[PDB]
């Protein structure tokens, strides 16, 4: 005989107040990227970036995350 | 017999308040990047990130986080 | 026989307050990076960078992070 | 009396065997300006906020200048 | 009496084997100006704010200025 | 009386074996400039806030500067 | 004036008497040759042989040779 | 004045007498060659040989060499 | 003035004299070559080999050699 019992309450939050949000200037100057290679060979869970000039601006009114995981495992 | 009980209790909060938020200026002068190289040979779970010039500019009104796991594992 | 009571209570808060928020100047002054390699050989959980050049401006308005484990493990 | 007569047989020469590829690529930038009131006169050559990138690759940049003159 | 007549046989010359590639490639760049009441006059030159590139290769630069002159 | 007559049979002359790849290749940067109230005369070369360079590769940077005068 | 009389005389005998010449095997076991490579990039007078796999019987009643080389120069 | 009167006189022999030749056996075991590479990047008078497996039964009834080299040279 | 008289006389004699020859076996085991490289980067006069397996039975009648180099030079 066994007996589990998984109950986590929860009642938590995760909040934000901002009076005003704005006057972002995301100017960036250019650049210059090069890359050189022979062969790319590239297997099984491969998470590969070559080569990037990239620009974000990300202004979320409220950036706020809960994640949360949960797991159970008989055997 | 065996008896678990799993019941953690959380009544937790992450806040924030901000009176404003702005006036940010995010101005990159640009840059030069050479990479060279012979094979590239990547395998198995492989993060991989050459030649860049990434820019960010992140202003979350409240980037607040609750980050949590829960994990039973019986065997 | 065995019994196990897993009950953290947890009424914790992680709170910030601000007055305002602004007038922050990211200029960063460009620059060179040049990166030289014969084969690039990577095998089994590899996170890598090469040849980076990267500006981030992160301004959150209330970058609080409350970051909980639990775990347990019969067996 | 006054006889101006210079003589000039002078010679600017250049050899050059060959050269490679001519490669210009511009990496782009941000240029910004908040000019006012400018007031220029007379032979006045200027520049306010520039970018410029050049490449300049002529096969014999040779050059020869000569300013005679007279006056009474 | 005045009798102006100087004489040049004179030679301004170069000799160069070769040269590889040219490659120019700029990097971008930031530029911001904020210039108010400027006043130029005669023959002025002027740069503000510039952020310049330049690649200048000629097979022979050789230069050769002369500025013969006379007056009464 | 004036006889001006100098005489010049002068050689400005150079050898060079060979150059390599002429690879130039700027970083970027960062130019800001506040100017106010400047007043310039006559002859000014001026540069203000500046972020230059210069890859200057001659097969011959060879210079014959000569100033001849006469006055009465 | 100059004068040159290149004579080199030669009178040199190569010889060779066998009685019989047989009864020779050549039965050798079954070879292999795996040959794996990538970009291949061969420029100005490359001499190259990749992946052979040569079987040869050579049996000549008299394989003599006599290899001789003449080279006058003046300058 | 100048003179030369190469006259090198030869007469030499180079012989050979067998009374038979044979009952000679190739029997080697099967060989095996694996050979693994990148990129081959061969300029400028490369002389290569990759992968190879040979086998040879040379039997000459008289294999006599006569290598001579007569190279005179005025400048 | 000058004079030269190159007269190198030869009457050498190389010779050999067999009553038989046989009853030779060339029986090795079965040979193995592995070969790893990455890039191969060959310039200006390379001579290479490379995973080579070589099986030689060579019996001459006679294998006599005779090599003989003459070189006068003026200048």
Known sequence: ????????VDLSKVTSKCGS??????KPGGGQVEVKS???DFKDRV???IGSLDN?????????????T?????R
Chains 1, 2, 3, 7, 8, 9 share one sequence.
């Open 21 to 26: 949000l704005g006057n972002i200037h995301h």
């Open 1 to 8: 005989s066994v007996q589990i019992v998984y109950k986590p």
């Open 47 to 49: 998470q590969s970036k």
């Open 38 to 40: 022979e062969k790319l």
């Open 70 to 74: 949960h797991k159970l495992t008989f």
């Open 56 to 68: 974000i601006t990300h202004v979320p009114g409220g950036g706020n995350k809960k994640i949360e």
